[PDB]
Amino acid sequence: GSSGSSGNLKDVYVSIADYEGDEETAGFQEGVSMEVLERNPNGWWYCQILDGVKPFKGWVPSNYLEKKNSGPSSG
């Protein structure tokens, strides 16, 4: 029973600022594609950096995330 686009929800957020990433947290750069996985009550959410060349996870600050509703090749 393969549908296609319909199946499971997904929240892809794009970084809107370059982060350094402490020794405990993970670092990244503005312009990466992450996928919101979990969200803590403190504000820190567990995303998944889809850098491609070197992807990695790590709780990042929601403040450094923006809903990427729009997509490329829009015309």
The set of residues, in sequence order, having a beta carbon less than 8 Å from that of 20 and lying 6+ positions away, is: 27
Determination technique for this entry = NMR
Give the domain extent around 11.
Answer: 1-75
40, 49, 41, 43: which is closest to 19 by C-alpha?
Answer: 49
The set of residues, in sequence order, having a beta carbon less than 8 Å from that of 12 and lying 6+ positions away, is: 33, 34, 35, 36, 68
Q: How far, in Å, CA of 67 to CA of 75, rounded?
A: 20
Q: How far, in Å, CA of 26 to CA of 33, rounded?
A: 14
CATH number at residue 14: 2.30.30.40
**Structural domain count of the chain:** 1
**Is 56 in contact with 64 (CB distance < 8 Å)?**
no
